[PDB]
Amino acid sequence: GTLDTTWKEATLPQVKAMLEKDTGKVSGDTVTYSGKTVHVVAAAVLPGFPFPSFEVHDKKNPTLEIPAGATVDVTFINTNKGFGHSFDITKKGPPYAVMPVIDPIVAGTGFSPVPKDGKFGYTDFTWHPTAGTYYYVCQIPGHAATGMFGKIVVK
Ligand SMILES: [Cu+2]
């Protein structure tokens, strides 16, 4: 309501499914979406992946290139058994603040759920971007500054 609260939970095989069903090509080090369905399948510190960075299927937030004319659909799989990680899209840019300064959020998620065994907290939220550059951050203290952010180049 405040932010996008489209919270759900699947299970492990759906994570595998979603990871396949992603339009994010590997621009060498960076990730680059393509097609009008910019289906951003992302995850946050799943038990095995170390802190503090956000996972983006093939990589861990190098940076995201986006085709401006497309519809963005952020599919989180935040299943960090501790922190209700958020995905909050705005500007700010690096360095991100240690204190979670909630600068005017465009699209964002007000802290997605914290599952138990087997189940996988996901959140499908939609966004229509504008050309140039934005950044997304997890507005939990330290998290953004320490690593879980992503530069969104919309061109
Ligand atoms: Cu976080």
From Swiss-Prot:
UniProt keyword list: Copper, Electron transport, Metal-binding, Periplasm, Signal, Transport
Cofactor: record remark: Binds 1 copper ion per subunit.
Annotated GO CC locations: periplasmic space
Binding site residues for Cu cation: H85, C138, H143, M148
Cofactor names: Cu cation
Positions of the Plastocyanin-like domain: 53-155
Keyword Ubl conjugation: no
Domain of life: Bacteria
Cellular localization per UniProt: Periplasm
Location (main, coarse): periplasm
GO molecular function, a single term: copper ion binding
Protein purpose: Electron carrier from cytochrome c552 to the A-type oxidase.
Oligomer status and interactors: Monomer.
Name under which the protein is recorded: Rusticyanin
Protein species of origin: Acidithiobacillus ferrooxidans (strain ATCC 23270 / DSM 14882 / CIP 104768 / NCIMB 8455)
Full-protein interval shown: 33 to 187 of 187
